């Protein structure tokens, strides 16, 4: 074997402790770069002028933040969607002031995670598996794209991408609610059905399987020792689990087919989260939540408020307060 | 028109209230629209010179049709609700409007995404089927069973 | 792929019970606190620094300005028994909006 | 910053006490006859 051939054999080897692969060849440097920059920035970055109004926001630990308040702050509104790599700055001090770390991190990350998905395909293929685990991972991945890239594209600025921090995340959510009424959007609602439903079905499946474990141990040892890695027989009695659940609701509401059941476990949260991502990605182009402000009107024409109008008042509070120094004209149009 | 000297008007942040510089120095509109300085349109271009928006042209050469057009466009911004209530999210019902640009953009993002999903699905399946394990693992020939342990 | 994996199916399924059940239980505890307005509303160190230094800004302080907006603008209609009348001039607002 | 002066020891003991509990149980499991 020649050198290129041996290299290829190693890269695609099924015997590496962590699989590399061709997707991994891109994933590994990109994820390291984003990770290293993110750690250094989170600890030590100076304040960043996120909204381009010379009003720097401190994100790092050494500059007065804790774990909860800290963030890597989005790049400047003065930059917009312009590509701002280190070499576009006159100096690192400039790069830092304008929020360069944010772009470096999110671009390397989105590429790397795209490659993580590809890699899930690739290893599935090397191992003789079916290929669709990657499709499942498309759901959280699309969501990251929505908040780090699609929303900025639609709004015309990376300054409106989600901040890389906990409180910054909450800021993004509140502003999003003010500007798109996301709660009243059916795609976000499907998202909630997807995650609540996922948690529900996770608990459900956990509890049913656990309830039907076959006796293989004594009381003074963990029931977990009754299963051994790679044994051929199923470790619980599915007919009993179904006997229980079908009687809890009714027979035809319970799954008796394990394959069908696990398919459902995959599909429900994955589809729901696909819609969550699409909610963000379409509100990116300002097609917003349902608006019923003053929809109900009496015989004279007095407005009769509904819960939608109370939501509207809350949204107004958020709207009039956000970025208190950045607007000079009466309409916030992005 | 009220008498403001818009070139010298300093806004609250210290940046020009109406006019400021892009990161490369071109004269642009101020406020949040600083992000949109790459925009170009026939109603705006007559006000543009070599260094960007030109103060003399602004002071002297803005035509009523430009004012009309800018009003029209400002008040048909592509913002609106799913039930086609025009304006920001907090706007009251009255105007029945969602921009065609929004309908087209959103529809095609949804479709493009699901089509990427479909690509992954059918590409992965095509690989598995061509290799012969799209229906599952052969119990008598499970590849992992003939591989060395990872540790 | 990920470096670690399940090897024990019984543990896997128990964990599937444990995770969402424990999460919901924790949320419940926090709500009991909110019953008493015993909130995690502030970081005191943040507020001391911010009150003394008008250039110090974090996402935490930004979120509080949003909350203040919510309270003032939603209260009169949301809490009608208080008969709130907030004159326009006292309403908190940034520039222009 | 004017942080709470008990936060450091609160955090240290919060980590140390249960971690040490787990380490003790782990090592004595290992030393049991194989």
């Amino acid at each position: 074997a020649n050198l290129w051939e041996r290299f290829c054999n190693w890269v695609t080897s099924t015997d590496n402790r962590l699989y590399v692969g061709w997707f991994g060849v891109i994933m590994i440097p990109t994820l390291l770069a984003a990770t290293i920059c993110f750690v250094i920035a989170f600890i030590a970055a100076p304040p960043v002028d996120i909204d381009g109004i010379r009003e720097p926001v401190s994100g790092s630990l050494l500059y007065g933040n804790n774990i909860i308040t800290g963030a890597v702050v989005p790049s400047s509104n003065a930059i917009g969607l312009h590509f701002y790599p280190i070499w576009e700055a006159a100096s690192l001090d400039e790069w830092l002031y304008n929020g360069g770390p944010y772009q470096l991190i999110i671009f390397h990350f989105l590429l790397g995670a795209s490659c993580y998905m590809g890699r899930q395909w690739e290893l599935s293929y090397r191992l003789g598996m079916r290929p669709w685990i990657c499709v499942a991972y498309s759901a959280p991945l699309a969501s990251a794209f929505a908040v780090f890239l699609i929303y900025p594209i639609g709004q015309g600025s990376f300054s409106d991408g989600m901040p890389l921090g906990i409180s910054g995340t909450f800021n993004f959510m509140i502003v999003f609610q003010a500007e798109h009424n996301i709660l009243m959007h059916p795609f976000h609602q499907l998202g909630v059905a997807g995650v609540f439903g996922g948690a529900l079905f996770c608990a459900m499946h956990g509890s049913l399987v656990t309830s039907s474990l076959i006796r293989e141990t004594t009381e003074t040892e963990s029931a977990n020792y009754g299963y051994k890695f790679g044994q051929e027989e199923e470790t619980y009695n599915i007919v009993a689990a179904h006997g229980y659940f079908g009687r809890l609701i009714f027979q035809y509401a319970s799954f008796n087919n394990s394959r069908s059941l696990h398919f459902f476990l995959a599909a429900w949260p994955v589809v729901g989260v696909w819609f969550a991502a699409l909610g963000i990605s379409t509100m990116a182009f300002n097609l917003n939540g349902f608006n019923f402000n003053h929809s109900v009107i009496d015989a004279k024409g007095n407005v009769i408020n509904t819960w939608a109008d109370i939501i509207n008042r809350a949204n107004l509070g958020m709207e009039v307060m956000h970025e208190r120094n950045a607007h000079n004209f009466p309409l916030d149009l992005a | 028109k009220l008498g403001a000297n818009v070139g010298s008007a300093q806004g609250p942040t210290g940046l020009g209230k109406y006019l400021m510089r892009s990161p490369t120095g071109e004269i642009i509109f101020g406020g949040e629209t600083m992000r949109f300085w790459d925009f170009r349109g026939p109603w705006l271009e007559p006000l543009r010179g070599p260094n960007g928006l030109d103060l003399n042209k602004i002071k002297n050469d803005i035509q009523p049709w430009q004012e009309r057009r800018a009003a029209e466009y400002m008040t048909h911004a592509p913002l609106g609700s799913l039930n086609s209530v025009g304006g920001v999210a907090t706007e009251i019902n009255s105007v029945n409007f969602v921009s065609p640009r929004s309908w087209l953009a959103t529809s095609h993002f949804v479709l493009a995404f699901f089509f990427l999903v479909g690509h992954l699905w059918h590409a992965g399946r095509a690989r598995a089927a061509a290799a012969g394990f799209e229906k599952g693992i052969d119990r008598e020939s499970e590849p992992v069973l003939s591989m060395p342990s990872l540790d | 792929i990920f470096g670690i994996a399940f090897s024990n199916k019984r543990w896997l399924h128990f964990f599937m019970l444990f995770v969402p059940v424990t999460g919901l239980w924790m949320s419940a505890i926090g709500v009991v606190g909110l019953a008493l307005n015993l909130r995690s509303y502030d970081f005191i160190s943040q507020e001391i620094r911010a009150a003394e230094d008008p250039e110090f800004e974090t996402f935490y302080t930004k979120n509080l300005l949003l909350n203040e907006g919510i309270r003032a603008w939603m209260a009169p209609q949301d809490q009608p028994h208080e008969n709130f009348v907030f004159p326009e001039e006292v309403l908190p607002r940034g520039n222009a909006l | 910053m004017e942080v709470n002066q008990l936060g450091l020891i609160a955090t240290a003991l919060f980590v140390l006490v249960p971690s040490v509990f787990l380490i003790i149980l782990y090592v004595q499991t290992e030393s049991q006859q194989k």
Binding site: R17, L18, I43, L61, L62, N66, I67, K228, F229, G230, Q231 | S149, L150, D151 | G3, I4, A5, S7 | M1, V3, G7, L8, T11, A12, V15
Partner: peptide, 30 residues
């Protein structure tokens, strides 16, 4: 002192990732 604490906990976590992956008890087919 705070920053040291946060960074220290984080560092312990990364170390833990290292041990949990590379020095795990190997899964054995019985």
């Amino acid at each position: 002192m705070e920053t040291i604490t946060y960074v220290f906990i984080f560092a312990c976590i990364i170390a833990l990732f290292f041990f949990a992956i590379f020095f795990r008890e190997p899964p054995r087919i019985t």
